[PDB]
Nucleic acid binder design. Sequence first.
RNA 1: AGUAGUAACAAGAGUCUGCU
Lengths: 739, 250, 701
Amino acid sequence: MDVNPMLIFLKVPVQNAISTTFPYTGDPPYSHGTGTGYTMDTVIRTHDYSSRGIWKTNSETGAQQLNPIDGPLPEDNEPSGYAQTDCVLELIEGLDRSHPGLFETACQETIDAIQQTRVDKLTQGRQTYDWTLNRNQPAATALANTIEVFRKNGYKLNESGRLIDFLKDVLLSFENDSMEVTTHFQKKKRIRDNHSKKMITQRTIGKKRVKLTKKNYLIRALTLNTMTKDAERGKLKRRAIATPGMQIRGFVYFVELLARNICERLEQSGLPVGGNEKKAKLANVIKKMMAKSTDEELSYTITGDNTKWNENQNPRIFLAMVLRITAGQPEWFRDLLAVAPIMFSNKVARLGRGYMFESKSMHLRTQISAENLSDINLRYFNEDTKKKIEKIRHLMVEGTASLSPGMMMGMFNMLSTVLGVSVLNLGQREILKRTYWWDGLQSSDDFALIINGHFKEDIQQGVNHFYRTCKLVGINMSQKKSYINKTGTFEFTSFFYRYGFVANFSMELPSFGVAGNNESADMSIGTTVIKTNMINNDLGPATAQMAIQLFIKDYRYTYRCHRGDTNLETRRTKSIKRLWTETISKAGLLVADGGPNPYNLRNLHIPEVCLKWSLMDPDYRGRLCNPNNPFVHHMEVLEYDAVATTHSWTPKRNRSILNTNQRGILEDERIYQKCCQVFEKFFPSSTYRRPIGMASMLDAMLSRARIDARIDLESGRISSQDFSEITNTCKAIEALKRQ
Amino acid sequence: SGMERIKELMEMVKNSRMREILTTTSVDHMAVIKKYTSGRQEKNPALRMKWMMAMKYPISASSRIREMIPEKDEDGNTLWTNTKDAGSNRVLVSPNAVTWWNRAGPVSDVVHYPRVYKMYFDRLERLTHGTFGPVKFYNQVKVRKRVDINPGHKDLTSREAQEVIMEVVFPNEVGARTLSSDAQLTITKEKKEELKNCKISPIMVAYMLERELVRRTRFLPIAGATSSTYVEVLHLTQGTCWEQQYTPGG
Amino acid sequence: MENFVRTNFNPMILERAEKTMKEYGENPQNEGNKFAAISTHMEVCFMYSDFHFIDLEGNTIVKMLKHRFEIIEGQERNIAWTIVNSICNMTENSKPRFLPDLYDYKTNKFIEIGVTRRKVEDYYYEKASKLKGENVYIHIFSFDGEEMATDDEYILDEESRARIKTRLFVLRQELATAGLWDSFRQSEEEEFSYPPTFQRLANQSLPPSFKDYHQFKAYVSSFKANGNIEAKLGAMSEKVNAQIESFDPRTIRELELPEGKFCTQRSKFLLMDAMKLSVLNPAHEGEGIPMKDAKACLDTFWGWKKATIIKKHEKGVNTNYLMIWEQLLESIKEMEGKFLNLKKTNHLKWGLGEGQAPEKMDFEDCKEVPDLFQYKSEPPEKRKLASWIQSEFNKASELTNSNWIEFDELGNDVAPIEHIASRRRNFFTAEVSQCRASEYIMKAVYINTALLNSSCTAMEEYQVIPIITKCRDTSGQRRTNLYGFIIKGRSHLRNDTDVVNFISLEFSLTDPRNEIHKWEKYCVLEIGDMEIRTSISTIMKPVYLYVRTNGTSKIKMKWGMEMRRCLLQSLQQVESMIEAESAVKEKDMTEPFFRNRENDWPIGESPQGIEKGTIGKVCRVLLAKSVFNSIYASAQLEGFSAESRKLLLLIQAFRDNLDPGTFDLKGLYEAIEECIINDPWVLLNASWFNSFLKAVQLSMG
RNA sequence: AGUAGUAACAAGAGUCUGCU
């Protein structure tokens, strides 16, 4: 009797037990080493799906650029990047005719939000390729480096503090024939280690002012940094994602804001929606495509993926789309929204970290970078990398490959959704006036397509019309991973619809473990995570109860805070048992103090200190909620009384790098922190609400200090000697400011 | 009272880099350099807490904890040690010190702890005195609506209770905004009359008045009651194929 | 104009004017009238404010005192409003609607100073109608000399007023000698352009028939569709089509499983061939410490022999493994304390791989090495399916005598849905706790937790990690089981994929010579003899020790510590079955789902056909499937599941009479069979899909 | 050797260990 779980599908339907087809309990696949190979794979695939385009040499970067659009039509079912401009413009014009006032209201809201957007909006989101350091930094760090390099040169429009003046400075900085940057350099010494007694190389990373050229600065400003996407499910082989820079991020924000304004008013778009909103949209399109009139109206549904979605959409098609949507609009708005497709059409790809090479006689290994991969013989590579470098050698410009056609993963998701929705919108009944008509739903690349007709030959004609119209605009439907059946069961972005019943499996189920901040924060975050997965992601009640039990078990293990009546004897169990013995009401001790678990399904929305407050001892609640506690940081007025518990402590932080001295580059973060602390000394509401002002920090602080001295003098709360001391200190600070 | 902070600013202006950063960066640019983080990040903070709690001193505390708790416990546990030649305002602390403080620390008064978190105690009062009904299993069709996750105050919208709060606790930094409602001055007078004998930071009573007065709306999938006292128990009252009939206390 | 202002005034007035013009969005190089007007307003306000003091008594002295006027003009609007709010909160006066220029502490008055080019009276009436409704004092100057304040009342001395009048008249006369006074009285949107570098970038990002960005932009804006889509569809080849091939599972083939050598065991511990030395109610004065419980479980086994290599690891040095076991047993014999760190001998250095990495240098020193070849990147060698993994999954779905999961307590159940969820959860936990998969969860959690703690505290130590689990009997007696030992290597883990090498030494009663392809990476010794008491007879069976070099990552240990999400996922599957039932039957269908004491669910395939089982067998099989997904996690399994989900949904679309169809079925089969290379669990899943396909084919004739 | 899989780790830039 050999056991087979798939025979469970003999009794229950597949959509009722589809969760067995998601092996999401083990570790997802990770990439080891560099991502140069996946980058060169993407470059070669993008230039091979477009190879019948026109080759030009960029007058500004010197990079070879391939232009596939308005080229020869495809002759086979391979992925092709020959999108037609007139067909794209016809589809956008038909989308405008179908939705009157959509483009006008979306462009109006985009103009309303351009003039009311700070530079701080670029401090939010994912990490950014810092062109100063040739690495990836966080968003605020790379933005501060960009603003510092701009204002050390003659570009200070960003002192206005709004995004469009920063973008004006970005476009103005391309004229600088010698940009002055502050790059991290490295000194190397050889030191014997005192523990292992081995000769290591101590690296001291400092700073150094370098002078880029116009060409080098433009190559760095057009660079997308590529790296391998790790921890991705559902795939056998890895792929490369890319991060943009700082010169392109605000323009991409404005274009994606426009396209987000478009896609919210479209019924056939699955972006930007949530967990149950997508289910309601699936039910809406199945409802609207099941209005039978005659005796037999056939209705079929394609569950469709697209093959090589980002490799085939050109930025010039996005330029034509963003110039057609912004029609009848001011020219500053059209140019500002058109900058980002121009930057993506002239873009370049940083090829990762290089490759590891190995000498088997000297028994050494060396990581040689992607810039060093040009002046090295082809005999030292393996076969795949030699083929890659032979195919990519004509595209290299100063360590980077020119990726002029195609996009990268996750740059314009909503604009590509707009193009797919325009293809879906072509197939209405009295627009086509045909024997078939299609509706459906469009994500970034996934789609569901309902085609109604009178005969199955009309269904086939509609599938062929949709497929060839997609091939006209550079969209390639995956024939291997799409299928078609009658309407009633389908799949859209791991949502499985069967006769009304929708199964959501778009999100991986979390571990429901400890978050890792402190004790009270992890308790609150864990109960909130269980509650939000119950509300949004269809988590069943018994699974949520077992999730509470697994979270309490992992929480009690991690912080070593098992109950007082337990037989486990950890490092903290003696003090916890001493607290357990002298406590009268044991139900009021927190879980971090050895108390019982109060939580269930009904009180997940209530914090633990509030939940056990009536059960606490008076002495225990006085000690736990003592406002003079030494674990939480106190801010001065003497300091204020704390209103947090003693379990909101701070873990010991460690950001050290092996054999790396980086105190020469870590000083500026501490200086920025001290400046923000003394500004919050002078202004009590700089951390409750963000302060505004084009004046300097020192000017604002001195202007506050003089007027507070004068008000305290005129109210009698200060003497004239302290007033004169404050005013003489402000005069001395102003004299050192001007000198 | 105004002299030590300006002498600290003078000692910062005597440093050249701090003077250049204070003179060049503006008040609108210090929201960008407030998050300037430079260093090697961590990718698994959960695993970091796992292997860091197994060490003896994972907690980082101040120097005042050298004089508030002893060095050794009653059982022989070292509650705190020093750092490697760092006599700063920061030492390392075992969670045995936290359990020590919770079992044998100084008892105080906690009378302001319910009134800061009065919203959560109100939620607990509605849940403790609520009455449940029979569960009904059917096909639950939840519609995404903009609902009120925080009801706020009457006669105050979301852009006006914030101005009341900016008047009450940070009055010299309101800017050009004035009180344009008759209820605003009464609420402002009452909140300033309450918050006078309080040694709690103004940010904490600002967030207290924010969760008392500022209304918050959110798109949520609801099939049933869309009131504010039903949005908070959405996890308890409905699911994919059932419906828990509930009546909150009040 | 511009040059007269810099040749004329003080640098303070110019600095204030440049700050105001940079704030408001102007520049001195573009406007000459507005720059000189802002400088004139600032100069009049500064001459109004300066040389006015209030002494310690209160009288205005004009020359250690304080000033009389607080300047609000020229300060930035946030700074000026901060000053205004601080003054208005010091006194009782309400705030003005707009920003004033000065504040007089003596009269306590907001002074507004407006200097025009026209007559004093008209500009005064304009500013009086504008600043109306508040007690803001006004004071209007001009270049003619006349003034008109609020109701012709003046708080300032006549000498300072005459001095400012003389300064303004001298300024008018200097502009008259400069000839710029004529265009001064007559002086009373968004832009985003392309610089030439970005213009030449924009002229190269077009469709190829265009050469200018504005030409293409005018083409896009003046575009009208005239059937271009149909004209391109008629001109495209007919070979670009999506032909719908009809899908029928009776006509499709099975998955092409690979060939070659048999798939070997690659789990980090022994699953069904692991025996345990157990102690019942341990009170050996360590009681929880892993090495103390390891010695307490090692003391319950007499019958150690001289160890001998009985099955060799074919690619290694088996004498090193023999010496590793001898050194480990001798160091356990002589250990002191709570932790055991082995002396780094040469056989332990071979078995843990110390010295096998080449010394990583930087490229700038190693440019002159001739034989510097790239790291080779070969695909995995394919392997054939063997019966041992099916036997392992058969054993993992069975019941034990021990209770292997201890859940923490909840709050009390008050809501009726909490009672329903507790009934469902207790049914699943009663059916699933005594399973072998729960024992594997316990083993993986303990091994990965202990390996992570030892890897992140003792990085330069060869630390002995005993494989310990704990359980409860049917009577609630605690039992502590020992399965073997893990000797940890050097773990300086920086990446998430950096490997710490370890050595596993696991006790067993299973002879490795019966299935020798399974134990490829192992070197099995014969360490003892055990008097095994069967039901009637008592046999003397040899106790083997499986010794191998393995390795793990920080990501793998992190996911092994989180192994109770297998119990979460299996309960989620069973609960989604119950929820999809109750969404149609409209009642709590939990009780007619677990109290089915008949066999209703097909879960097996005997030679007599397809076998059915109860719901508890199904929940144990779903738990075992999640556990084996966690143990043998790979990219092959991920790709295979994601690709064969489509074929499962196609078979379901056929069974629902929904007329399924495909576009490239051979490509789907190639995408499925590309992810089946050498992992035993993905090979068993491929065989499982083939068995399910044959079952659903024979179900429909 | 082993982990592993399209390229890497197998060290020298990324005083601690107790889950019934």
